[PDB]
Design a protein around this ligand. Structure first.
Ligand SMILES: *[C@H](/C(C)=C/c1ccccc1)[C@H]1SC(=S)N(NS(=O)(=O)c2ccccc2)C1=O
Length: 554
């Protein structure tokens, strides 16, 4: 069936959309080429609609059925419970999209009688009606990127589809415990959201070292959400139903699946009918869990079809990486074409064809690649990094414009061991926080899809836990990494790393002169900036599951 059917009505914005980086002294000091930074808007929605709209002709075989049978067996050992309205309300983000029935996120969090009444009303309706399609709102996402001349064009806006606030609260009650506990049990070590950054790089390295003749490859599915069929979503439900569940939970899950997840009508911000969806909605609670389960199922089946030896997969929604035993270059290449053929039959063709890689560092999965550096003692340390272009473009944007999004803090947290996050991001932002006396201001930031409120002053502690103490002592970065960073800075017009060392020394001194956590930040985060090193001793729920698009607040 067609992933989407459109009426003609346009995907419209709900408010003014900023698209260009303003000339701002603060952002200019970080990146001079402001014209290269842009934010996607609803104006490119049509280009995205065109790409995500196509016919899926899914054909399933025995390998697929065998894997599914094995997954359900594991799911049978899981027990999940319903969440109380109170529990679901507390998981709702403070600035979550308000309901169309006279109440908003604040009313929900506060448990206002009106919000609570509508929620119960929606829940009861889910139990009584398991057929009538639930309405959803389709919008174009506003995300920031840097122009890529080689790509021959700007990135079109991504589309987000989500149901009313009342429905989202019900989703939580019916499936939050399921999507938070089931994945790990069914996919074991392959489930990527159970790992902190340090555990992830450890799993990748250990997995690679466990093979005799290692070969790995990432598989990029073209428009994954669009490739997810009604049957995929129903197979997903059958997996949830294998759990030990409460009677109305089963009914709620059946109802949500039939009325929302398998598809439904699309409505723009103006209230007009844009069409119908028959694929995955990017903006529901089960998006992450469902995509991960589906990707895992198809990929596992495809590994068997391709006859790959001693395969180990790591999955995070639609992001997939496989590490196995090589059979030779010509044979590996042929095996991958077979793997791709199977995925295509399962309704999951590739964007870029997968390529066998024989060097772990050359594999990009979850937009990251493993790299190596050395700690104070010269000991080899593996860590995850990535081209810093997008992070820096977003950092410049967030410096110039008041955005409720703080991707820069997420980047420092997740990529703390990198030379770019340490020398550039930490330096630039702590300088700003000092000038504005905002060191104590808590900022919201997404981690594995969930929203957390984080204090920048708690970074040292957070980093030690997520990466280990070595994150504050890494040096002797690989030639490849150093070159990628340097090339990125030239492209964006970002001051060279040496210019950052000077700034960091000044910032470090200012932090040390301040009290408590501030001095700890100066000592641990900027020890790299001084020759006379200080002694870095141990400083005196984030990685359990994925929730991208799930409207979750922790
Ligand atoms: C990829 C991913 C899991 C990246 C990763 C993990 C650990 C260390 C470094 C990178 C996808 S899946 C997902 S949800 N992501 N958002 S995140 O919150 O995990 C994140 C935020 C900022 C920087 C890296 C990851 C991913 O990025």
């Amino acid at each position: 069936s067609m992933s989407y059917t459109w009426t003609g009505a346009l995907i419209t914005p709900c408010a003014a959309e900023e698209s260009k980086l303003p000339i701002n002294a603060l952002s200019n000091s970080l990146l001079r080429h402001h014209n290269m930074v842009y934010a996607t808007t609803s104006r490119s929605a049509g280009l995205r609609q065109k790409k995500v709209t196509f016919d899926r002709l899914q054909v399933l075989d025995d390998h697929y059925r065998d894997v599914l049978k094995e997954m359900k067996a594991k799911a049978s050992t899981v027990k999940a419970k319903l969440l109380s309205v109170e529990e679901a309300c507390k998981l709702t983000p403070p600035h979550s999209a308000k309901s169309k029935f006279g109440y908003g996120a604040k009313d929900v969090r506060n448990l206002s009688s009106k919000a609570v009444n509508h929620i119960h009303s929606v829940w009861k309706d889910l139990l009584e009606d398991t057929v009538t399609p639930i309405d959803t709102t389709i919008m174009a996402k506003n995300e920031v990127f840097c122009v890529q001349p080689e790509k021959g064009g700007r990135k079109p806006a991504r589309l987000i589809v989500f149901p009313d606030l009342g429905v989202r609260v019900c989703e939580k009650m019916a499936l939050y415990d399921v999507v938070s506990t089931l994945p790990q049990v069914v996919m074991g070590s392959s489930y990527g959201f159970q790992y902190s950054p340090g555990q992830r790089v450890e799993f990748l390295v250990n997995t690679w070292k466990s093979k005799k003749n290692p070969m790995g490859f990432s598989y990029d599915t073209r428009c994954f959400d669009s490739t997810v069929t009604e049957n995929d979503i129903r197979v997903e439900e059958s997996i949830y139903q294998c759990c030990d569940l409460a009677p109305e939970a089963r009914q709620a899950i059946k109802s949500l699946t039939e009325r929302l997840y398998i598809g439904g009508p699309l409505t723009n911000s103006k209230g007009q009918n844009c069409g119908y969806r028959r694929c995955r909605a990017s903006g529901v609670l089960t998006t992450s869990c469902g995509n991960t389960l589906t990707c895992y199922l198809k990929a596992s089946a495809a590994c068997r079809a391709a006859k790959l030896q001693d395969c180990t997969m790591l999955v995070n929604g639609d992001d997939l990486v496989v590490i196995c035993e090589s059979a030779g270059t010509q044979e590996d290449a042929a095996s991958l074409r077979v793997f791709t053929e199977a995925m295509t039959r399962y309704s999951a063709p590739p964007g870029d064809p997968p390529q066998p890689e024989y060097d772990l560092e050359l594999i990009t999965s979850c937009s990251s690649n493993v790299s190596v550096a050395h700690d104070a003692s010269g000991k080899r340390v593996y860590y995850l990094t990535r081209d810093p272009t997008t992070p820096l473009a977003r950092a410049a944007w967030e410096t110039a414009r008041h955005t409720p999004v703080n991707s820069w803090l997420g980047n420092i947290i997740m990529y703390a061991p990198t030379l770019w996050a340490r020398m550039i991001l930490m330096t630039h932002f702590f300088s700003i926080l000092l000038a504005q006396e905002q060191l104590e201001k808590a900022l919201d930031c997404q981690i594995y899809g969930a929203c957390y409120s984080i204090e920048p002053l708690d970074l040292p502690q957070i980093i030690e836990r997520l990466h280990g103490l070595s994150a504050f002592s890494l040096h002797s970065y690989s030639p490849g990494e150093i070159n990628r960073v340097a090339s990125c800075l030239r492209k964006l017009g970002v001051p060279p790393l040496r210019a950052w060392r000077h700034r960091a020394r000044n910032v470090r001194a200012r932090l040390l002169s301040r009290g408590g956590r501030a001095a700890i930040c100066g000592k641990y985060l900027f020890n790299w900036a001084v020759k006379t090193k200080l002694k870095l001793t141990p400083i005196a729920s984030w990685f359990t599951a994925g929730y991208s698009g799930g409207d979750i607040y922790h």
